[PDB]
């Protein structure tokens, strides 16, 4: 289950990264000063957003752009924490074997 | 196991920090405007990237530089979450002793 949800989180994260990159460009174009207006760097922004690396070179300036951003943040946070939860359940189970329980 | 994988994650993280610092300079040089072009600050960038401290003073501007960045992010995220998972298994085991189970 934990391994499945982890893999499910990864494939969902990828989808969100792709869709989020596409939706960002669509939302940002039309607003003067926006830098998130091309797909290649938008995808790079999506990775930055999901990981929270905080380079701060690219960010949305519109309402819907920021809404897309939030979805990517939470998706990244949920995913990277589901993996942590999956790794924990793995270690907990292995500990319950090296003690014979 | 949990303690081993934690130590394994730390030594791998260090390797990724070193290699990532070297690969970044190799990838960034040749691209006008790049600041990630010297090894000392590239190593500092690697630590920033793995921890996600988000100072935003240094970041790659090339495709392969960004690819190196992603590997460091995930390595840092995996490592710092494996340690969390290891600490959790430690506490869970100790709780199963103070209750006599």
């Amino acid at each position, epitope marked *: 289950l934990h391994w499945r949800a982890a893999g499910a989180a990864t494939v969902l994260l990828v989808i969100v990264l792709l869709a989020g990159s596409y939706l960002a460009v669509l939302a940002e174009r039309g607003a003067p000063g926006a830098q998130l207006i091309t797909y290649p760097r938008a995808l790079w922004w999506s990775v930055e957003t999901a990981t929270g690396v905080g380079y701060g070179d690219l960010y949305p300036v519109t309402l819907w752009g920021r809404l897309v951003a939030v979805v990517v943040m939470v998706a990244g946070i949920t995913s990277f924490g589901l993996v942590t939860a999956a790794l924990a359940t793995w270690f907990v189970g292995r500990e319950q074997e090296r003690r014979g329980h | 196991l949990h303690w081993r994988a934690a130590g394994a994650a730390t030594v791998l993280l260090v390797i990724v920090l070193l290699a990532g610092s070297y690969l970044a300079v190799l990838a960034e040089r040749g691209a006008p*405007g790049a600041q990630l072009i010297t090894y000392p600050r590239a190593l500092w960038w690697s630590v920033e990237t793995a921890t996600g401290v988000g100072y935003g003073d240094l970041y790659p501007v090339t495709l392969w530089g960004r690819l190196v960045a992603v590997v460091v992010m995930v390595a840092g995220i995996t490592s710092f979450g494996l340690v969390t998972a290891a600490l959790a298994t430690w506490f869970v085991g100790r709780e199963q002793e103070r209750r006599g189970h």
Partner: antibody, heavy 118, light 106 residues
Framework: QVQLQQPGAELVKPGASVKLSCKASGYTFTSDWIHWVKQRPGHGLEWIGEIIPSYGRANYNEKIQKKATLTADKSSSTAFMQLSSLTSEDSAVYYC???????????WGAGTTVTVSS | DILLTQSPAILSVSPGERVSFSCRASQSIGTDIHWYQQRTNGSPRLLIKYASESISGIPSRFSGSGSGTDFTLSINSVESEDIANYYCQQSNRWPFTFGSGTKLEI
């Protein structure tokens, strides 16, 4: 093969309107944006607006008077530009261009010479 | 909006020499600049994308350099077919904008 096909010329009466077309061919991606550029005789290039056919979303130049309305047909792969209430100031060559969503205009149409007179 | 200044407006060069077109942005745009050529009665044609990247079908005597706010289009050994107007265009911030244009003269 020619990727963007525009009619050679369009004669318009002052006050009337005209609907320019831009039939496309070649590779088609959802990331494709169709742009329109105005060039008056002896002048330079002037970005009018853009549109993404796979959504119908359109953006326009805010620094100029809005004379244009962008639409597209996904089936016939044709982009449309509605110019309304035209004066002599609107007499120019109107180009259409295709952008892969990476910032540059790879291919241009031959351009439509729009003349506004009675 | 990003302002792109192309000075001078006209360049007079002798056959075989190396010429350089200038494009200055009103603010830092990295390397998000693109160069186009337009001959008489012709449509614009992409010469250089992202400051220095080459385009297929374009003669190798065309090159580009620069970053930030200062960009240069260079033609190596200018010949008669290079006689045209040259425009630069940025894609860093919305909306996209063009330079005033520079005419080559032999």
């Amino acid at each position: 093969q020619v990727q963007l096909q525009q009619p050679g010329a369009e004669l318009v009466k002052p006050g009337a309107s005209v609907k320019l077309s831009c039939k496309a061919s070649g590779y088609t991606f959802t990331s494709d944006w169709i742009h329109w550029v105005k060039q008056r005789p002896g002048h330079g290039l002037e970005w009018i607006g853009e549109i993404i056919p796979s959504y119908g979303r359109a953006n326009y130049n805010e620094k100029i008077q809005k004379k244009a309305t962008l639409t597209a047909d996904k089936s016939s792969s044709t982009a449309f530009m509605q110019l309304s209430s035209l004066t002599s100031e609107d007499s120019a060559v109107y180009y259409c261009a295709r952008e892969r969503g990476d910032g540059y205009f790879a291919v241009w149409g031959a351009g439509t010479t729009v003349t506004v007179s009675s | 909006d990003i302002l792109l200044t192309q000075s001078p407006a006209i360049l007079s060069v002798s056959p075989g020499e190396r010429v350089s077109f200038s494009c200055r942005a009103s603010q830092s745009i990295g390397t998000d600049i693109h160069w186009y050529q337009q001959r008489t009665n012709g449509s614009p044609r992409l010469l250089i994308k992202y400051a220095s990247e080459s385009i297929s079908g374009i003669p190798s005597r065309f090159s580009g350099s620069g970053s930030g706010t200062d960009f240069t289009l260079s033609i190596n050994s200018v010949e008669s077919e290079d006689i045209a107007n040259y425009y630069c265009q940025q894609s860093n911030r919305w909306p996209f904008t063009f330079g005033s244009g520079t005419k080559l003269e032999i």
